[PDB]
Amino acid sequence: RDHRKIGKQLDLYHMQEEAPGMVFWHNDGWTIFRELEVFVRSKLKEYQYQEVKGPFMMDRVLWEKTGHWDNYKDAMFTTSSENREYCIKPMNCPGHVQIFNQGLKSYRDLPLRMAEFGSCHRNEPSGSLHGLMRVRGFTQDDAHIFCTEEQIRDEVNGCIRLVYDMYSTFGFEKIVVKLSTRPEKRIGSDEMWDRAEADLAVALEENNIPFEYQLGEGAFYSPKIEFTLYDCLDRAWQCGTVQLDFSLPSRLSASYVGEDNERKVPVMIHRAILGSMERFIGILTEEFAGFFPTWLAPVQVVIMNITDSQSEYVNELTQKLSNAGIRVKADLRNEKIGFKIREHTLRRVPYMLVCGDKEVESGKVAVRTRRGKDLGSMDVNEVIEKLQQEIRSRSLKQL
Amino acid sequence: MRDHRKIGKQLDLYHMQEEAPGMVFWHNDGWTIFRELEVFVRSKLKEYQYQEVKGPFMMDRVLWEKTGHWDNYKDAMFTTSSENREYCIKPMNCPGHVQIFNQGLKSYRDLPLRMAEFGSCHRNEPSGSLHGLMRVRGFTQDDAHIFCTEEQIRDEVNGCIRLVYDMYSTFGFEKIVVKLSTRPEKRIGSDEMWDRAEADLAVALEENNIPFEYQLGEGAFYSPKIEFTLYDCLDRAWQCGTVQLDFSLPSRLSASYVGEDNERKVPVMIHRAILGSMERFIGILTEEFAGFFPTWLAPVQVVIMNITDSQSEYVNELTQKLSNAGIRVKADLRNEKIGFKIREHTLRRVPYMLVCGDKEVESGKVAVRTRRGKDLGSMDVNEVIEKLQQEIRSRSLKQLEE
Ligand SMILES: [Zn+2]
Ligand SMILES: [Zn+2]
């Protein structure tokens, strides 16, 4: 259950000293990454989020006004062009404010939910790097909600609902929640921190969530709710975060026109559900021990022939399943069928289809799984419908 | 209005600012177009059997020195440092894909290996040369690299050629001009390899019955390239496609495989990009259609509007129905006159506008109007959905009844 070892055996990714802390996503690993993005986007549509994309580097002055430069200077990569210094972004917060600052906003535009799969870079110490868990370049399922003070409770409730909704899809039902309060170095008045901390605590209470206080562990600009999931080995993984931010939009000149026709500074809610998506893939790899659920499996079906007599039949089946939306590969190599089956079983391919002369004449296919279960000969259309149901429902296990 | 910068502002597609010169802030509507382009390209990757990978953003400068890229492009490269090591923000995807290739032992059975990526590239272009979406500092390329044997060159180059005309025809580009860019004066690689690479590219164009002209000295410093230029509706030339035959870089990056004769060989590498910079291609499409993006690319495909509050419930029901059908649909329930709403969404170039009166509510129908000012009359909602889905799935250039 080491994600580094499983990642190598399944050819998911690799890392090398020429790019410390940054991941080379191979075809099979990138397929898992993209399927996670599809799942998140399905939630972005359901929870009514916009999706945007920000530039990778911006002027260092942007990070000076937020206070991040004074506080996280050592952790940020910098580059220069024409006597101007730019920072490769470690977070998506200022970039989303820049998009919000384009075009005059009114209260009718709020709540404005802005999500992004933003890849961030942090100059972490090289000795602290570890596989997919602690990296230098990563992608977060980030989002920022611009809202009024009256809309804080509903929007924080939506973020909390989304956390439990997404975690349950992967089978994580044991979740421990902590609330981080003001640190010893911060921005924003005590009243603002008093209201922000109280709002987060009330939201947890109103959602029937018990929590502990992490005193002084909040960000320098906002308190945060931190969600920790527990894997099948009862190991704790802090993944989700919700921040109630009353300071950064003001420092970035964000404003909207209220119903009173008065200029107001919007409330910003930061949230990420999965956290670093590279890290989440590593957690899933160890949770499933490489046996990814069918909807996440890089290759869902492999169809093999026994002899060259079934080569045409396998190709027709592969196209049919491919057109049905199934990630399917044909294995027509000159090897024993038992050699082909073992190769794909070790790759944890959920379903393996074998076509002999009996299958060709009958129009059926023999089905076995990576767990060694023999499902016998099944109708081709029945196999497709079963696969589609397992994929579209994102079922954890085979039916 | 045909300038993509003006249309982009009117349609709220993107914005740029001096805090990040030559780098695009993609708004929701603009990012939707970008993602639809990604979905289209990925459909071709599936059809043409490409892998899709993702490389790191920065790599050791010593890796860019090995290919000669540092000596040629160092003034155009962004550099950053960490722990007394200097890193280059990648301006191209070639070395990263070779690094993926070099992982694990490769044999002839693994070739051809087609490796694609939507690679985010950055180049330190002069600020005076930047212009909208056409000339930027940060961009994404629909790049791919094919690792193959010498015997596989002709079929793999032919596949790249076919993909170029396949993808351009989807957007309505049928006037294509082809150039073969030969070796530049400042160059790496042997004379014999350059002769073979240039001859192979020329023969591949001959087999596809494609007339072309040579472009002396315009090839890359390591390989020649076929350059494809498309012509827009104003007969303006846009160089987008590129196919490179490369015998130099894989050797310099220690790429190798075990041949059928059980001896180590250096694979051939074919570089190709169809659209080129996808930000630039979006700008070209924006000007080509003058904001009238085809329905499959339109950020908002359908807008449903009421006349009074009596149809507010019916409009909301249909918006949910169309959204569940996979159609990007928005409801317009503001207290404005219906002509005011239609004019506003026509200026947003929304393909279809659905008007629901009380006669529409009882009949379960919708009054269909288009951004071209055409009245299509009342139609059944399910019939509307069926035709819209067919228009989107076929990526049709034309709307209903035109
Ligand atoms: Zn944030
Ligand atoms: Zn290349």
Residue numbers in the entry:
A (entry chain B): 242 to 640
B (entry chain A): 241 to 642
How did the manuscript describe this experimental structure?
Here, we report that a critical glycine residue (Gly463) dominates the motion of threonyl-tRNA synthetase (ThrRS) and the sensitivity of the enzyme to antibiotics. The natural product Obafluorin (OB) is a potent inhibitor of bacterial threonyl-tRNA synthetase (ThrRS). Our previous work showed that OB covalently binds to ThrRS, forming an ester bond with a tyrosine residue in the catalytic center via the highly strained β-lactone ring, making OB the first covalent aaRS inhibitor with demonstrated crystal structures. The binding of OB induces a large conformational change in ThrRS.
We noticed that Gly463 and Leu489 are two strictly conserved residues in the ThrRS proteins, but they are replaced by a serine and a methionine in the ObaOs, respectively. Therefore, the mutation of Leu489 to a methionine does not confer resistance of EcThrRS to OB. In contrast, OB showed poor activity against EcThrRS_G463S, with 5 μM OB inhibiting only approximately 10% of the activity of EcThrRS_G463S, indicating that mutating Gly463 to a serine renders EcThrRS resistant to OB. In contrast, cocrystallizing 300 μM EcThrRS_G463S protein with 600 μM OB did not result in an EcThrRS_G463S–OB complex structure. No electron density of OB was observed in the catalytic pocket of EcThrRS_G463S under this condition. The active pocket of this structure has neither an OB nor substrate molecules, so it is in an “apo state”. The conformation in this state is similar to the “adenylation state” of the EcThrRS_Y462F–ATP complex structure we determined earlier, but slightly wider. This structure also indicates that although G463S weakens ThrRS binding to OB, it does not disrupt the active conformation of ThrRS. In the EcThrRS_G463S structure, the hydroxyl group of Ser463 is 5.0 Å away from the phenolic hydroxyl group of Tyr462, which attacks the lactone structure of OB and forms a covalent bond with it. Thus, the sidechain of Ser463 is too short to clash with the presumably bound OB and it is also unlikely that Ser463 will directly affect the nucleophilicity of Tyr462 and prevent it from forming a covalent bond with OB. However, the motion of these two groups was positively correlated in the MD trajectories of the EcThrRS_G463S mutant, suggesting that the pocket of this mutant is relatively rigid.
